[PDB]
Amino acid sequence: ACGXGDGCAKXCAASCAAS
Hints:
Elements: no helix or strand
């Protein structure tokens, strides 16, 4: 659930699901 574009978020927020 993350476009993974420029300035994207890493970890539990977009890049990762945390859970």
